[PDB]
Design a protein around this motif. Structure first.
Motif, PDB file in Angstrom:
ATOM      1  N   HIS A  41       2.001   0.225  -7.183  1.00  0.00           N
ATOM      2  CA  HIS A  41       0.670  -0.321  -6.926  1.00  0.00           C
ATOM      3  C   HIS A  41       0.602  -0.942  -5.537  1.00  0.00           C
ATOM      4  O   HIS A  41       1.571  -1.535  -5.064  1.00  0.00           O
ATOM      5  CB  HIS A  41       0.282  -1.354  -7.988  1.00  0.00           C
ATOM      6  CG  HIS A  41       1.181  -2.550  -8.028  1.00  0.00           C
ATOM      7  ND1 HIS A  41       2.551  -2.449  -8.156  1.00  0.00           N
ATOM      8  CD2 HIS A  41       0.908  -3.875  -7.970  1.00  0.00           C
ATOM      9  CE1 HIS A  41       3.081  -3.658  -8.166  1.00  0.00           C
ATOM     10  NE2 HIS A  41       2.104  -4.543  -8.060  1.00  0.00           N
ATOM     11  N   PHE A  42      -0.548  -0.793  -4.886  1.00  0.00           N
ATOM     12  CA  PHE A  42      -0.735  -1.286  -3.529  1.00  0.00           C
ATOM     13  C   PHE A  42      -2.133  -1.854  -3.330  1.00  0.00           C
ATOM     14  O   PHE A  42      -3.112  -1.332  -3.868  1.00  0.00           O
ATOM     15  CB  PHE A  42      -0.537  -0.159  -2.513  1.00  0.00           C
ATOM     16  CG  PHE A  42       0.848   0.416  -2.488  1.00  0.00           C
ATOM     17  CD1 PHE A  42       1.165   1.524  -3.255  1.00  0.00           C
ATOM     18  CD2 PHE A  42       1.826  -0.132  -1.675  1.00  0.00           C
ATOM     19  CE1 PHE A  42       2.438   2.065  -3.223  1.00  0.00           C
ATOM     20  CE2 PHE A  42       3.099   0.404  -1.639  1.00  0.00           C
ATOM     21  CZ  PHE A  42       3.405   1.504  -2.414  1.00  0.00           C
ATOM     22  N   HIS A  43      -2.217  -2.922  -2.546  1.00  0.00           N
ATOM     23  CA  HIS A  43      -3.496  -3.396  -2.044  1.00  0.00           C
ATOM     24  C   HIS A  43      -3.696  -2.741  -0.687  1.00  0.00           C
ATOM     25  O   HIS A  43      -2.838  -2.849   0.189  1.00  0.00           O
ATOM     26  CB  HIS A  43      -3.497  -4.917  -1.919  1.00  0.00           C
ATOM     27  CG  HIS A  43      -3.205  -5.625  -3.206  1.00  0.00           C
ATOM     28  ND1 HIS A  43      -1.949  -6.086  -3.535  1.00  0.00           N
ATOM     29  CD2 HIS A  43      -4.008  -5.942  -4.251  1.00  0.00           C
ATOM     30  CE1 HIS A  43      -1.989  -6.660  -4.724  1.00  0.00           C
ATOM     31  NE2 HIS A  43      -3.227  -6.584  -5.180  1.00  0.00           N
ATOM     32  N   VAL A  44      -4.808  -2.038  -0.517  1.00  0.00           N
ATOM     33  CA  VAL A  44      -5.040  -1.325   0.731  1.00  0.00           C
ATOM     34  C   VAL A  44      -6.113  -2.009   1.572  1.00  0.00           C
ATOM     35  O   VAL A  44      -7.100  -2.523   1.038  1.00  0.00           O
ATOM     36  CB  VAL A  44      -5.432   0.146   0.484  1.00  0.00           C
ATOM     37  CG1 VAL A  44      -5.631   0.874   1.807  1.00  0.00           C
ATOM     38  CG2 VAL A  44      -4.374   0.848  -0.358  1.00  0.00           C
ATOM     39  N   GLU A  45      -5.906  -2.027   2.886  1.00  0.00           N
ATOM     40  CA  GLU A  45      -6.909  -2.553   3.799  1.00  0.00           C
ATOM     41  C   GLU A  45      -7.910  -1.460   4.140  1.00  0.00           C
ATOM     42  O   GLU A  45      -7.525  -0.335   4.457  1.00  0.00           O
ATOM     43  CB  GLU A  45      -6.261  -3.127   5.059  1.00  0.00           C
ATOM     44  CG  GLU A  45      -5.281  -2.195   5.749  1.00  0.00           C
ATOM     45  CD  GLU A  45      -4.379  -2.927   6.724  1.00  0.00           C
ATOM     46  OE1 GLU A  45      -3.491  -2.280   7.317  1.00  0.00           O
ATOM     47  OE2 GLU A  45      -4.555  -4.155   6.888  1.00  0.00           O
ATOM     48  N   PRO A  46      -9.206  -1.792   4.064  1.00  0.00           N
ATOM     49  CA  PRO A  46     -10.286  -0.821   4.267  1.00  0.00           C
ATOM     50  C   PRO A  46     -10.150  -0.103   5.601  1.00  0.00           C
ATOM     51  O   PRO A  46      -9.913  -0.753   6.618  1.00  0.00           O
ATOM     52  CB  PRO A  46     -11.549  -1.691   4.256  1.00  0.00           C
ATOM     53  CG  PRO A  46     -11.070  -3.095   4.497  1.00  0.00           C
ATOM     54  CD  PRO A  46      -9.717  -3.160   3.876  1.00  0.00           C
ATOM     55  N   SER A  82      -2.024  -0.093   4.791  1.00  0.00           N
ATOM     56  CA  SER A  82      -2.863   1.000   5.259  1.00  0.00           C
ATOM     57  C   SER A  82      -2.881   2.110   4.216  1.00  0.00           C
ATOM     58  O   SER A  82      -1.854   2.399   3.595  1.00  0.00           O
ATOM     59  CB  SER A  82      -2.337   1.544   6.586  1.00  0.00           C
ATOM     60  OG  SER A  82      -1.082   2.183   6.408  1.00  0.00           O
ATOM     61  N   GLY A  83      -4.045   2.726   4.023  1.00  0.00           N
ATOM     62  CA  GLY A  83      -4.192   3.796   3.052  1.00  0.00           C
ATOM     63  C   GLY A  83      -3.032   4.767   3.116  1.00  0.00           C
ATOM     64  O   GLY A  83      -2.446   5.129   2.096  1.00  0.00           O
ATOM     65  N   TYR A  84      -2.699   5.182   4.333  1.00  0.00           N
ATOM     66  CA  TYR A  84      -1.541   6.026   4.574  1.00  0.00           C
ATOM     67  C   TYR A  84      -0.306   5.490   3.865  1.00  0.00           C
ATOM     68  O   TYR A  84       0.341   6.208   3.107  1.00  0.00           O
ATOM     69  CB  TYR A  84      -1.267   6.121   6.075  1.00  0.00           C
ATOM     70  CG  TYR A  84       0.166   6.468   6.411  1.00  0.00           C
ATOM     71  CD1 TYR A  84       0.569   7.791   6.539  1.00  0.00           C
ATOM     72  CD2 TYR A  84       1.116   5.473   6.601  1.00  0.00           C
ATOM     73  CE1 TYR A  84       1.877   8.113   6.845  1.00  0.00           C
ATOM     74  CE2 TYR A  84       2.423   5.784   6.907  1.00  0.00           C
ATOM     75  CZ  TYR A  84       2.799   7.104   7.026  1.00  0.00           C
ATOM     76  OH  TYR A  84       4.105   7.419   7.330  1.00  0.00           O
ATOM     77  N   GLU A  85       0.018   4.224   4.117  1.00  0.00           N
ATOM     78  CA  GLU A  85       1.240   3.633   3.578  1.00  0.00           C
ATOM     79  C   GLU A  85       1.363   3.822   2.069  1.00  0.00           C
ATOM     80  O   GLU A  85       2.355   4.366   1.584  1.00  0.00           O
ATOM     81  CB  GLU A  85       1.335   2.147   3.933  1.00  0.00           C
ATOM     82  CG  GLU A  85       2.511   1.793   4.849  1.00  0.00           C
ATOM     83  CD  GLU A  85       3.862   2.163   4.256  1.00  0.00           C
ATOM     84  OE1 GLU A  85       4.781   1.316   4.292  1.00  0.00           O
ATOM     85  OE2 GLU A  85       4.012   3.302   3.763  1.00  0.00           O
ATOM     86  N   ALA A  86       0.353   3.371   1.330  1.00  0.00           N
ATOM     87  CA  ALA A  86       0.339   3.528  -0.118  1.00  0.00           C
ATOM     88  C   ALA A  86       0.525   4.992  -0.505  1.00  0.00           C
ATOM     89  O   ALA A  86       1.468   5.341  -1.215  1.00  0.00           O
ATOM     90  CB  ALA A  86      -0.960   2.988  -0.698  1.00  0.00           C
ATOM     91  N   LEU A  87      -0.377   5.844  -0.023  1.00  0.00           N
ATOM     92  CA  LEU A  87      -0.361   7.261  -0.370  1.00  0.00           C
ATOM     93  C   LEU A  87       0.957   7.934  -0.009  1.00  0.00           C
ATOM     94  O   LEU A  87       1.485   8.730  -0.785  1.00  0.00           O
ATOM     95  CB  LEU A  87      -1.531   7.988   0.291  1.00  0.00           C
ATOM     96  CG  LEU A  87      -2.923   7.678  -0.261  1.00  0.00           C
ATOM     97  CD1 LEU A  87      -3.974   8.484   0.479  1.00  0.00           C
ATOM     98  CD2 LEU A  87      -2.974   7.981  -1.744  1.00  0.00           C
ATOM     99  N   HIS A  88       1.485   7.616   1.168  1.00  0.00           N
ATOM    100  CA  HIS A  88       2.776   8.152   1.579  1.00  0.00           C
ATOM    101  C   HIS A  88       3.847   7.812   0.555  1.00  0.00           C
ATOM    102  O   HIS A  88       4.667   8.656   0.194  1.00  0.00           O
ATOM    103  CB  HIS A  88       3.190   7.600   2.942  1.00  0.00           C
ATOM    104  CG  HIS A  88       4.596   7.943   3.326  1.00  0.00           C
ATOM    105  ND1 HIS A  88       5.673   7.147   3.002  1.00  0.00           N
ATOM    106  CD2 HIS A  88       5.102   9.003   4.000  1.00  0.00           C
ATOM    107  CE1 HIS A  88       6.781   7.699   3.463  1.00  0.00           C
ATOM    108  NE2 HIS A  88       6.461   8.827   4.072  1.00  0.00           N
ATOM    109  N   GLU A  89       3.839   6.565   0.100  1.00  0.00           N
ATOM    110  CA  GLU A  89       4.833   6.104  -0.856  1.00  0.00           C
ATOM    111  C   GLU A  89       4.623   6.748  -2.223  1.00  0.00           C
ATOM    112  O   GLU A  89       5.567   7.248  -2.836  1.00  0.00           O
ATOM    113  CB  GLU A  89       4.799   4.580  -0.976  1.00  0.00           C
ATOM    114  CG  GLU A  89       5.922   4.018  -1.832  1.00  0.00           C
ATOM    115  CD  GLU A  89       7.286   4.509  -1.379  1.00  0.00           C
ATOM    116  OE1 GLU A  89       7.515   4.585  -0.151  1.00  0.00           O
ATOM    117  OE2 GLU A  89       8.121   4.831  -2.251  1.00  0.00           O
ATOM    118  N   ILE A  90       3.383   6.736  -2.700  1.00  0.00           N
ATOM    119  CA  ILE A  90       3.069   7.324  -3.992  1.00  0.00           C
ATOM    120  C   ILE A  90       3.534   8.776  -4.069  1.00  0.00           C
ATOM    121  O   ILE A  90       4.101   9.201  -5.076  1.00  0.00           O
ATOM    122  CB  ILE A  90       1.562   7.259  -4.285  1.00  0.00           C
ATOM    123  CG1 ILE A  90       1.140   5.823  -4.600  1.00  0.00           C
ATOM    124  CG2 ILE A  90       1.211   8.176  -5.441  1.00  0.00           C
ATOM    125  CD1 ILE A  90      -0.327   5.677  -4.949  1.00  0.00           C
TER     126      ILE A  90
END
Ligand SMILES: [Co+2]
Ligand SMILES: [Co+2]
Lengths: 205, 205
Positions: free
Chosen positions: A54-59, A86-94
DNA sequence: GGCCCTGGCCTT
DNA sequence: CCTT
């Protein structure tokens, strides 16, 4: 004979996803947070949650922050200690764990499980685009919609009423939160799939 | 018992759509097929009514060559029996809106394979015709692609039918009419197969 | 936010 | 792969 997960969904690798946003427009509205839960299968053939993220993403800069969406989910993008990314960060990890999970499973392609899936699937893809992410392990248009599945198995479309009718405990006030939903969702799917197996629905005979 | 009691008041309508491309906003609608459902006294689900239409592409419509080569439809053919997008839907809504009053349901819900696609295209068509009082749910759909994944462990329509013990003639695959009928038979199948194994009613078991 | 009805459903 |  066939114990494995890969066999149950034609080689698809079901990953659970929920998303909290700053509106309903996947293109223009900000992704505030995202949670992902992979599944696993035992030798008896039973389905259960595996690993959780789970991640909190900055808009994304330029993104809209609809006031009501914020009123609903009670999120504050401005909060400093949010620890957002950053959206990238979360998605990259997921993704990396999902791919890693696919190889282990022997699956060929991941598929998103979500309640009213398109919505979430919509936001994710849009987020990967902004992020310029590539090699996305998810299917581009195929989804397992827990709203539809609950309609067949339980006769309920709402996530709340579905979880309650299925015998689960569902705290509606905690629902707004991402990690809680992805959890209540993941279990639902497992309960729906497993009950199906109990009534002799699977294997197919 | 009754259809109304099976899906928390929803009126399931099966649909397959043939289009000029993938963009629901820009590309054209060429064929639309719809099949309402009914339930016998024992509580069995079977096809009630069937509608199909050939659609004239809307003015300004985009017609992807790649697509037309796939479905092999000739839009300019005057011997097509094509009608206005408005005429096709007004007739479907007319049939659907009435079946709902008949079964004491509250509103309709689209049953389709990868339902989002068809749903995306139908709503965009309704907007073009500036049609009002749309009986269907704004965003809730039963995806037979996912449902088949649960019931039969298959996602592809042809295999979902075949593996469900059905006939599927890939020769008629580009016909909204044939496609829809094959879908309704598969949906009534999955829904009914659930009742057989005692999955429904929920309490009885 | 985007369609129902004369705000209220839902995935926010 | 498989909703045009
Ligand atoms: Co982002
Ligand atoms: Co039209």
């Amino acid at each position: 004979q066939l114990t494995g997960l890969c066999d149950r969904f034609r080689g698809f690798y079901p990953v659970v996803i929920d998303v909290e946003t700053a509106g309903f427009n996947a293109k223009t509205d900000a992704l505030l947070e995202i949670a992902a839960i992979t599944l696993k299968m035992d030798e008896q053939g039973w389905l259960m949650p595996d690993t959780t993220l789970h991640f909190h993403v900055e808009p994304f800069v330029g993104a809209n922050l609809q006031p009501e969406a914020l009123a609903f989910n009670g999120i504050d993008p401005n909060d400093p200690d949010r620890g957002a990314v950053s959206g990238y960060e979360a998605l990259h990890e997921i993704f990396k764990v999902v791919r890693k999970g696919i190889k282990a499973s022997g699956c060929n392609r991941a598929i998103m499980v979500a309640h009213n899936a398109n919505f979430d699937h919509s936001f994710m893809m849009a987020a990967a685009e902004r992020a310029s992410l590539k090699r996305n392990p998810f299917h581009p248009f195929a989804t397992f919609d827990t709203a539809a599945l609950a309609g067949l198995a339980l006769g309920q479309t709402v996530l709340s009423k579905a979880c309650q009718t299925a015998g689960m405990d569902f705290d509606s006030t905690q629902a707004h939160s991402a990690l809680y939903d992805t959890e209540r969702t993941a279990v639902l799917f497992c309960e729906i799939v497993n009950r199906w197996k109990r009534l002799g629905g699977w294997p197919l005979s």
